[PDB]
């Protein structure tokens, strides 16, 4: 009856779940298991470029804590 639209709606819902889940897993994979750094403002970008400079491996996401200093 009416519930035969539910396979098509379910397949459409899976096909809409794929982009958001995909970009979340890609942001966690390309950034060391964390969110993607949002730089809307130039201060956030300056901190991100500082992280890229202080990581030593030319990657902003590799974080260095108190173990880097003595």
């Amino acid at each position: 009856m009416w519930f035969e639209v539910l396979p098509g709606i379910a397949v459409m819902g899976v096909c809409l779940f794929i982009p958001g889940m995909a970009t979340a897993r890609i942001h966690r994979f390309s950034n060391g298991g964390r969110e993607k750094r949002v730089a809307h403002y130039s201060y956030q970008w300056y901190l991100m470029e500082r992280d890229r400079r202080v990581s030593g491996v030319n990657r902003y996401y590799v974080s260095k804590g108190l173990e880097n200093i003595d």
């Binding site: 949002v38 202080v54 974080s63 804590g65 108190l66």
Partner: protein, 171 residues
Amino acid sequence: PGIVELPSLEDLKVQEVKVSSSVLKAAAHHYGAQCDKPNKEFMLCRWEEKDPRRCLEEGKLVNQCALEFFRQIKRHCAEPFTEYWTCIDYSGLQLFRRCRKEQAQFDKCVLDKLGWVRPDLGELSKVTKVKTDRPLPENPYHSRARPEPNPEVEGDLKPARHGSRLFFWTM
């Protein structure tokens, strides 16, 4: 014109604060509390000299006082701070609001073991007064002598000599 005068490469060598931005943002309020005085001496020197080359030594004091800020965290409260900057480091916009329990643990461990009060909402944006012994720069714009202005008008205004003197008009 003249040779620009830059400091040498050995003049700029200092032990940098080699930590990430989330490590800095996690320790930011206690850094603004405890490392107040050389930071404000430096930023006062920086807005008064208007020249970074005349601000290096005070800047080194900043890089002297930040590291002693972190070692005193590293000697006492390394692990709650490590968990706290890790939780700050997870987020994209690096929200303080997503990490309040690690913040409470870090503030409790710091207030117990070191006796630092975290600054409240409104304190770190204050304009503070700084006691320095360096002289006030008498010409921070490297300006020169302003030209002499034109002489003003003075004296009582007498009538026009013989009127308008326009070809034949006697008034």
